[PDB]
Amino acid sequence: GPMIDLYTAATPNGHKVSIALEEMGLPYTVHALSFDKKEQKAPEFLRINPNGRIPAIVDRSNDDFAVFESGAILVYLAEKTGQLMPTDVKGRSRVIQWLMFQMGGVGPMQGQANVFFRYFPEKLQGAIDRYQHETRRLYEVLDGRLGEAEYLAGDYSIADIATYPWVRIHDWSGVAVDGLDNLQRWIAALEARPAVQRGLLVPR
Amino acid sequence: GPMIDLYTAATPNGHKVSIALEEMGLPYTVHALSFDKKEQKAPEFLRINPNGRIPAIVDRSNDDFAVFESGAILVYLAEKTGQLMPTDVKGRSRVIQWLMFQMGGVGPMQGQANVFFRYFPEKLQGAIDRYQHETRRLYEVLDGRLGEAEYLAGDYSIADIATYPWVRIHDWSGVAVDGLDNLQRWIAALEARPAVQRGLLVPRDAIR
Ligand SMILES: N[C@@H](CCC(=O)N[C@@H](CSSC[C@H](NC(=O)CC[C@H](N)C(=O)O)C(=O)NCC(=O)O)C(=O)NCC(=O)O)C(=O)O
Numbered sequence: 105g106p107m108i109d110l111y112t113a114a115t116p117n118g119h120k121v122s123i124a125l126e127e128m129g130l131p132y133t134v135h136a137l138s139f140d141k142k143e144q145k146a147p148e149f150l151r152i153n154p155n156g157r158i159p160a161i162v163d164r165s166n167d168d169f170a171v172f173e174s175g176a177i178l179v180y181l182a183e184k185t186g187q188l189m190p191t192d193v194k195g196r197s198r199v200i201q202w203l204m205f206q207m208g209g210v211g212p213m214q215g216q217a218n219v220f221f222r223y224f225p226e227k228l229q230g231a232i233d234r235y236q237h238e239t240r241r242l243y244e245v246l247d248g249r250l251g252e253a254e255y256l257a258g259d260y261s262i263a264d265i266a267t268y269p270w271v272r273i274h275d276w277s278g279v280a281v282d283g284l285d286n287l288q289r290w291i292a293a294l295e296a297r298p299a300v301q302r303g304l305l306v307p308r
Numbered sequence: 309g310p311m312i313d314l315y316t317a318a319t320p321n322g323h324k325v326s327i328a329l330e331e332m333g334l335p336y337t338v339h340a341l342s343f344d345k346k347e348q349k350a351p352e353f354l355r356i357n358p359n360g361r362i363p364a365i366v367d368r369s370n371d372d373f374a375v376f377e378s379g380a381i382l383v384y385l386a387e388k389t390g391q392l393m394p395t396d397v398k399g400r401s402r403v404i405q406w407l408m409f410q411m412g413g414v415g416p417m418q419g420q421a422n423v424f425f426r427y428f429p430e431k432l433q434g435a436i437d438r439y440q441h442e443t444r445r446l447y448e449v450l451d452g453r454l455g456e457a458e459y460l461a462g463d464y465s466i467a468d469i470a471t472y473p474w475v476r477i478h479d480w481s482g483v484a485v486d487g488l489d490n491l492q493r494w495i496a497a498l499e500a501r502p503a504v505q506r507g508l509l510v511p512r513d514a515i516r
């Protein structure tokens with residue numbers, strides 16, 4: 105079968121990896137973990153990702169080598185296929201920089217907006233405001249960069265793939281993109297890519 | 309003279325990079341930014357890091373190339389020097405995985421514990437508990453891995469360097485390490501390293 109096993113769920117972080125696999129044309133096997141049944145905390149899965157979160161992959165071509173953390177999976181797959189990250193020092197670093205910005209900024213902060221605005225047992229408007237405002241600030245950083253280049257690292261790369269599934273759900277998080285015309289251009293460009301469309305449907 | 313300019317402050321995230329440079333033996337020029345004077349938001353610095361945060365470096369050996377995000381700086385420098393990250397596929401990836409775990413988990417979550425426990429004007433015990441509990445859960449992940457391997461990726465690497473400055477301040481964040489014997493072993497090993505001690509002194513904490 106496929107050489108990549110993908111452990112995932114219908115979430116922004118899972119969609120990063122299914123989008124990348126679809127863009128790269130790599131076959132994969134989907135393991136859709138049920139958070140309802142706490143399958144992401146099963147010790148059989150903890151052997152693959154000790155953090156007990158999705159996504160994770162196992163590369164069957166590499167002696168069943170596990171890779172956890174969406175950003176690390178994106179780097180691993182880009183380096184395996186030679187796609188979606190340049191090989192030169194500056195070009196690869198620009199991808200890694202914007203990927204790290206997503207991994208330490210956009211994902212964590214927008215995820216906390218979702219917690220306080222949608223999930224938390226009571227409404228704490230000061231915490232909601234903190235994370236919605238911070239996410240907007242991060243979106244403004246993105247927008248400025250997207251006036252310098254068509255995609256975050258220049259050419260389209262894994263940095264865009266990491267960032268887009270989060271920006272796509274800004275309405276759920278209560279964070280606006282109005283006034284960020286470069287970000288909106290990039291949203292439209294990403295949305296029009298067939299591989300993005302396919303990756304957003306994994307898992308069903 | 310030094311060909312790396314380091315823009316930093318006395319904080320866990322800045323210490324990751326000074327520790328790495330000290331371990332690598334790569335000279336650098338320190339630019340200690342004053343948060344009180346808002347130097348991290350000055351236009352000149354935003355041209356280096358558009359996020360307006362430290363750390364950032366400028367590599368004077370390749371046309372003043374800027375690198376922002378501590379984790380990206382660690383990858384950039386490890387690749388340049390050939391140190392603190394293997395070059396084979398599996399060894400490189402294990403380092404990147406644990407580095408990402410720090411960058412997306414330990415740093416963000418412990419940072420939020422610090423905000424709510426010790427900076428935010430509103431005292432929100434549910435938010436404090438959320439982030440102290442999550443930081444502890446992340447420490448338990450580290451502890452389990454450190455029962456299988458001496459350092460997070462096997463050999464000591466940039467992943468340990470990224471993680472240690474945060475773990476070191478656990479008590480300040482209100483998070484205990486009791487019951488995490490492997491993490492405690494690793495804390496003692498990191499604290500003993502001369503380059504860790506040197507890097508923790510740079511720049512001459514401002515925030516956490
Ligand atoms: N840094 C990791 C994050 C992976 C991650 O967050 N996985 C989520 C699904 S993505 S859905 C978005 C996700 N939210 C959550 O996981 C909500 C539950 C969580 N336990 C909590 O209390 O915050 C989030 O905010 N992520 C922050 C980020 O990306 O930095 C998961 O498996 N959760 C199951 C669990 O926790 O038991 C990566 O990039 O792969």
Ligand SMILES: N[C@@H](CCC(=O)N[C@@H](CSSC[C@H](NC(=O)CC[C@H](N)C(=O)O)C(=O)NCC(=O)O)C(=O)NCC(=O)O)C(=O)O
Nearest residue numbers: 208319321348361362363377378379415416419420515516
């Ligand atoms: N992902 C970046 C994070 C760098 C970072 O946070 N730098 C801080 C100093 S380290 S001190 C630790 C830092 N806290 C802060 O920066 C507190 C101020 C912030 N604006 C807030 O509201 O949270 C934090 O929690 N970081 C989370 C993480 O590492 O993921 C900074 O320059 N702040 C200036 C500013 O905000 O104006 C990296 O790894 O380089």
